[PDB]
């Protein structure tokens, strides 16, 4: 009989388990025997307090480095305002030690945990690449609770070295199975930011994780977009509980918050899942997340059923992670087929946007060719366009099965006249659909202003396979 942790703050970890069903179903995974043993997670952040009484027992120097100061020791820099507490808080969510009379427990409280000190300084492309590419045959899972500015006017993503690190990680990392990159989808909710304007979350190589409050609502800081894959609990209003974790100076906190707290919980659940089947590829893991995540009782006004019967929201992706269901489905999972890529250049001539532009195109999805896709995974609309005020644009993409993805919602603060330069807007919402047939791109001016511009390129990029479907939900 599984005995749940006795740690003093475990009863306050409302998101891990409970009779109420408002949790991530993590105790059910623990009871199946999965606690993270043998899995290695690295927190890419401002450092990790490696001697913290709730981290020391799980700490892994092989999962750690200090990129800011070019040394192996990721110890945080101590300051009066405890500025560098952030990475230690994230690490405790993943792998805080259980049953040791200290604070609470990690989701994967027997996993090995490290940290890359890379935020305490100028975060260049090279700094990101050296962190994302750290010891990729030892680290299984990378957790990143940082990214481009959430001011609601930035469009930015990995530069060349960082993108090269993503492709090297998913291709050769973890023995060729692929590094698992977990990303926090963003804190830009108050600025009406879109997490599709963030190339890290929008990447197909990352599992972008959004947040839900204790009462099942969309937090004030949440960013909606089509690239988000799933959700974990985090903070909300001041009547809702928050996240319990290790804090700087060997302390315990019950007030960890924001998008930053969601990705580490996902990384922990993925660690449990990898223990249940160490042969899962980076794409396997995203399939498991899609199939097992739970919409129920998450409140949103945009829940839609896609072409294969799955509910999906721009606030939540496929819903809340379910650790028990993840580890159960992992055990007998059949590795997916190799990833195919079908490139469809849509336009025959540039198109003026004006007040509204609709581009319709019927595709065969590389019928007759070795990259024929009948089972979609990610889809991208790679758009090049000019426009006088970028944030007045709203962009939607409709799949042949009728699933409408919001690629871009209005961003009131985005006054940019720089448009989009082959920006690869990504949607997870048509996962497992057949992409053959009519795709529709809609670009509209959401303001009364007389805006102007031109769409000069629209590449539809389909990823997926031609085998192995399930009966739709």
């Amino acid at each position: 009989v599984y005995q749940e942790p006795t740690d003093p703050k475990f009863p306050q970890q409302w998101y891990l388990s409970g009779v109420t069903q408002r949790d991530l179903n993590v105790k059910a995974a623990w009871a199946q025997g999965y606690t993270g043993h043998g899995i290695v997670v690295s927190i890419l952040d401002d450092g990790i307090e490696k001697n913290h009484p709730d981290l020391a027992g799980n700490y892994d120097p092989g999962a750690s480095f200090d990129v800011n100061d070019q040394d192996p020791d990721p110890q945080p820099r101590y300051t009066q305002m405890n500025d560098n507490r952030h990475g230690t808080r994230c690490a405790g969510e993943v792998a805080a030690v259980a049953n040791n009379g200290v604070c609470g427990v990690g989701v994967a409280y027997n996993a090995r945990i490290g940290g890359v000190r890379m935020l305490d300084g100028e975060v260049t492309d090279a700094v990101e690449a050296r962190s994302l590419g750290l010891n990729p045959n030892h680290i299984h899972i990378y957790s990143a609770s940082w990214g481009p500015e959430d001011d609601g006017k930035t469009v930015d993503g990995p530069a060349r070295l960082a993108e090269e690190a993503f492709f090297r990680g998913v291709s050769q990392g973890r023995g060729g199975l692929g590094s698992i990159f977990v990303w926090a989808s963003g804190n830009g909710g108050r600025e009406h930011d879109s997490c599709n304007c963030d190339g890290y979350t929008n990447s197909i190589y990352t599992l972008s994780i959004s947040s839900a409050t204790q009462f099942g609502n969309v937090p004030w800081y949440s960013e909606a977009c089509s690239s988000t894959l799933a959700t974990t609990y985090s903070s909300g209003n001041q009547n809702e509980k928050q996240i319990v974790t290790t804090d700087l100076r060997q302390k315990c906190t019950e007030s960890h918050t924001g998008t930053s707290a969601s990705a580490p919980l996902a990384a922990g659940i993925i660690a449990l899942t990898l223990e249940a089947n160490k042969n899962l590829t980076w794409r396997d893991m995203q399939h498991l997340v899609v199939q097992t995540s739970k919409p129920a009782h998450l409140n949103a006004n945009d829940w839609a059923t896609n072409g294969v019967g799955r509910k999906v929201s721009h606030s939540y992706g496929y819903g809340l992670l379910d650790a028990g269901a993840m580890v159960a489905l992992a055990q007998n999972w059949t590795t997916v087929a190799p990833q195919r890529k079908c490139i469809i250049d849509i336009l025959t001539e540039p198109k003026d946007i004006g007040k509204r532009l609709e581009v319709r195109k019927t595709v065969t999805a590389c019928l007759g060719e070795p990259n024929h896709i009948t089972r979609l995974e990610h889809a991208q609309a790679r758009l090049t366009l000019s426009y006088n005020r970028r944030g007045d644009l709203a962009i939607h993409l409709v799949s042949p099965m009728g699933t409408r993805s919001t690629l871009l919602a209005a961003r009131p603060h985005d006054y940019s006249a720089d448009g989009f330069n082959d920006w690869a807007f990504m949607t997870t919402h048509s996962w497992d659909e057949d992409p053959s047939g009519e795709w529709v791109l809609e670009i509209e001016n959401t303001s009364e202003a007389n805006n102007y511009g031109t769409l000069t390129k629209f590449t539809l990029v389909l990823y997926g396979t031609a085998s192995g479907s399930l009966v739709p939900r």
Partner: peptide, 5 residues
């Protein structure tokens, strides 16, 4: 900043 917590 180029990147933020």
């Amino acid at each position: 900043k180029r990147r933020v917590k």
